[model samples]
Target chain A: PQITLWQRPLVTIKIGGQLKEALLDTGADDTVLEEMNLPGRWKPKMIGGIGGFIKVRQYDQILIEICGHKAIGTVLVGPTPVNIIGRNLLTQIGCTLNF
Target chain B: PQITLWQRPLVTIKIGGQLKEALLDTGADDTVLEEMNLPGRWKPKMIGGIGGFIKVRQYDQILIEICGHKAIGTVLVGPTPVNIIGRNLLTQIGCTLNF
Candidate 1:
């Protein structure tokens, strides 16, 4: 499967049974989403990136669907300016860079 | 051509006869490089991102090669934490998101 790179490469992703828009961020190491409610237990975590470090709630073994590809992995929820689909989930979906 | 996504998807790019590593950032709108000398005139500008805004020198018609693909366009030089290849140059190289 392939996804065209729009100016922002925005994509629709379903997480925790809800649809949300996320930026496919290869530069980010972890999948970070805008703060949201989770149904299970989680841990507090911190991640560093372009801007700086951010503290978040790390939810493990969550189901997510990106562009029709389904995956289960850890998701970080926090005060992120935008929802980001980082490498953690991108790998699960077998995403690659193409020219 | 296809490039596998590393954890960070780092790529070697050649700019102004110098090779440098950069992150392929779909989240960023403009290509940004570590501050460097340029041969021509450029206008000072600013770009906002995850953390905040930073002043940059906008160089036009500069040649940049990423993963064997060459592009000529606006290149922003600034005090960035890391070098980033954004959509401006990515589109020139015919890059796309694939799974």
Candidate 2:
């Protein structure tokens, strides 16, 4: 599937047996989801973004389905404005930026 | 050129007779340059992100040559960690997310 950037580039993703819209954020180094409850032992972490640095719960080896493609990686749960499918997971789904 | 998300998706863009490395940020709503002087009147605007909001100067109808492709749109200048070629410019260049 080819997704154009005309809009927000928002796409549906399934995580933790729930569906949510997420942005395919190529700029972000790691995936960050809005604060949520997930069954896992996560580490306290911090990541820098547009405004400043913020703390997050680093949950590793999480499974997420982006556009129906299965991917496993670290997911950061914190106070993020939106659900971001960063380069980490984007690479896992073999997503590319094409002109 | 088709850019894979295996990397940061950084690309060379020419703006205001200058060349700089920028991230193709599908997450960003607008294109924001770190700190550059552009000729024209600009308005002070606030944009929100991961942690919080930041101040920026919005310059309209700015010309940027992204990866040898030309695009004209609003450009934000301020205290950004890196130059971001956001969805605004990406759409103009017909960039798409493909799997």
Candidate 3:
């Protein structure tokens, strides 16, 4: 399946058995979710972007579902204003940039 | 043609008769270029992202070529840390998000 990169490409995603909306962010290297109760061991990491840097909990091996496509990888939890589905998970779902 | 959204999908773009590398940033709403002297009148605008907000010179109807695809639209010039090809120009070239 394919989707247009609209003005703001917001999509449905399921993580940790909860459904949420996330922005498809190709500019981001890692996935970031708004503060959520993620179960498992995690490490403290800081990520920087257009908004500077913020501390986050990096949880490894988490199941993520986007547009019916499933992927398992790292998920970051923090005080993010918005949930962002980055390239890490996008590639897992075989997403490509086409013109 | 298609391109994989690798770690960072960097591509070459021609603007103002100069070629430069830019990131294909789906998260960004507007295209941003590093400090450059653009001919024509522009209005002041502010854009916000992960890094907060910055003042920019918004130039309209600027010609931009990315991977042989040509598009003319709004291009913002400011003190950007990196050149970003946002969805504004991507969609003009018929770029889509596919899996």
Most TM-score-accurate candidate: 2
- Indicate which candidate wins on lDDT: 2
Candidate 3 lDDT over B1-99, as tens digits, reads 877766698999999899999998888888999999888999999887654677889999999999878899999999777899998998898988888
Which portions of model 1 miss their true places by more than 4 Å?
none
Q: How would you class the docking of model 1? A: medium
Model 2 Cα shift for residue A26 (angstroms): 0.6
Question: What lDDT score is found at residue A12 in candidate 3?
Answer: 98
* Candidate 3 local distance difference test against the native: 0.88
> What does the lDDT read for residue B58 in candidate 3?
95
Give the docking tier of candidate 3: medium
| Reference-based lDDT, residue B6, model 3 | 66
- Give the distance in Å from residue A52's predicted Cα in candidate 2 to where it truly belongs: 0.1
Interface RMSD to the true structure, each candidate: 1.9, 0.8, 1.5
Ordered from best to worst lDDT, the candidate numbers read 2, 3, 1
B16: Cα error in model 3, Å:
1.3
Please give, for residues A1-92, the per-residue lDDT of candidate 3 as tens digits: 77787668889999888999999888889999989898899999988775467899999999989999989999999977789999999899
TM-score for every candidate vs. truth?
0.90, 0.97, 0.94
lDDT of 2 by residue, B1-99 (tens): 889887788889999999999999999989999899998999999988987989999999999999999999999999988899999999999998889
lDDT of 1 by residue, A1-99 (tens): 665554687889998788999998777778889978877999989776555566889999998898868899999998888899888888888888888
Give the per-residue Cα lDDT of candidate 1 at A25: 76
